Amino acid sequence: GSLTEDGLSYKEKFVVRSYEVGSNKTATVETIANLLQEVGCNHAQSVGFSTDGFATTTTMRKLHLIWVTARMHIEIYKYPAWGDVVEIETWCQSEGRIGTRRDWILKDSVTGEVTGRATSKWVMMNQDTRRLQKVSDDVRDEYLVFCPQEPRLAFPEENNRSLKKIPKLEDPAQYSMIGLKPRRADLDMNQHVNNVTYIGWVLESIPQEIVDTHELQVITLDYRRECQQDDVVDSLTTTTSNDSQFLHLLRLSGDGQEINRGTTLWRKK
Amino acid sequence: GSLTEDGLSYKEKFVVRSYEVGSNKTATVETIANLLQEVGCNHAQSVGFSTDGFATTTTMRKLHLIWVTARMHIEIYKYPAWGDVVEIETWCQSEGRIGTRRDWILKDSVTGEVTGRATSKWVMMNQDTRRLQKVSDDVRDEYLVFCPQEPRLAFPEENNRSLKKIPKLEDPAQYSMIGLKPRRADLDMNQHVNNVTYIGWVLESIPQEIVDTHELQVITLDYRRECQQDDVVDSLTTTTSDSQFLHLLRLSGDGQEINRGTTLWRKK
Ligand SMILES: O=C(O)c1c[nH]c2ccccc12
Questions:
Q1: Separation of alpha carbons A240 and A222, rounded Å
Q2: Which of B2, B56, B92 to mutate to test the pocket of ligand 1 (most atoms within 8 A of CB)?
Q3: Is the Cβ–Cβ distance between B183 and A201 less than 8 Å?
Q4: Which of A94, A202, B81, B145 is deepest in the core (most CB within 10 A)?
Q5: What CATH superfamily is the domain A2-163?
Q6: Do A22 and B184 touch (CB under 8 A)?
Q7: A93 and A151 in contact (C-beta within 8 Å)?
Q8: Cα B201 to Cα A48: distance, rounded to the nearest angstrom
Q9: Rounded CA gap, B144 and B125, in Å?
């Protein structure tokens, strides 16, 4: 991988592996989400930021501050086949004191065609107290020099799906998958559950008949609270809709505390 | 990746990714096992065999025959760090009518040093009846031309750890992790549980204190029966000692054995 000529974005190529594909012999959305994370991490390393998933600056480390994902939105037009080369370009932009946004564009390396796009909202949090906070001026100037100054959006459209509010699923859910637990492979280097695991857990409550006859086109996921290594999760889904749409909710198995909410849009094969 | 000059082995380089490493910022044994599978798959493709993980020849496809793993043995001297380039060389050898063996050597790309080695035993099975069978002459000649004719072993040493018999853990287990279930990410393209998932399930019953103070050096795993997509597994472990453990994976309900294994851990 490498930073582009202007040094304001990063590009990297990946060859889709045998264990990364599903029943269609094309990459799963969890494989895509992992590659998005990998290219984000290589971009942060290329400009001197922390490499640990928190992308911290020198001032953030002293203050015990970290970047945490608040929302992930992914749209796939074509999933790359096993053996195909996919090129991913990523960039970061500040959204004032609210937080930062990381965007991605996925392309077929051979044709140069846009096969997918993604956007994510990140917020600053003290890693010990878990208290959210606005971005200060001192932290901001340290990373403004690595972001384009004019707006660059993966989802430029006026009322795009990436900014829609997600409602809370009401009991009873139409479908559910209960008692989901992370194993060591689901953890990152800091022993926290990897953000992509939650995508997998959301998708667990989609009936196999939908997965066999449809392809996932769009997924929007809000992250409200973290699943601890010793927590148990219930995944709930209700159909809201040729296209099929669903509302999703992940909550702790016991007390029903919300950890994530989301929506998915599926097109008939 | 590419077949080597003599066309009897295959080599491929991998850069260790951020999500592939554990608490030590080095690749997990599950990441290693996935890369071994990937290089095996690229070797089969390079010589015209099936894609799907079953590495079938033309005659096997007509007879509904597949290759299935019976045992996996991996020894790691150094886990590659995040961002490091690891080179993996793989080759196959027939073991008469018993089945086939696939071996691997892992190296640090910069130093050229051997950082790990692995071996696996594969048996032929009818995909529909799941009945094991010896390898016929007709199936054999089709793949003998892709194997070295003189023996080439990743574990040459006499009485090496890759061929030791594994006993059955007796109840009560010292440690356990119950109710383990696969999710869609644990499945391969054929909707079968990926062989590497069983390694993760075995390791789930190792106490976190061992994982924090030791590094996994050797793992030997026997595959007896497959976990279906709707099955539930219990992972059992007992200390037999460096620290050594005996492992057992069995179905949560009736206690049917799916795997047995052993692990050897070195103090950090
Ligand atoms: O798939 C098989 O049966 C194979 C036996 N020897 C090999 C060498 C390379 C790739 C696949 C095989």
A1: 18
A2: B92
A3: yes
A4: A202
A5: Hotdog Thioesterase (3.10.129.10)
A6: yes
A7: yes
A8: 37
A9: 19
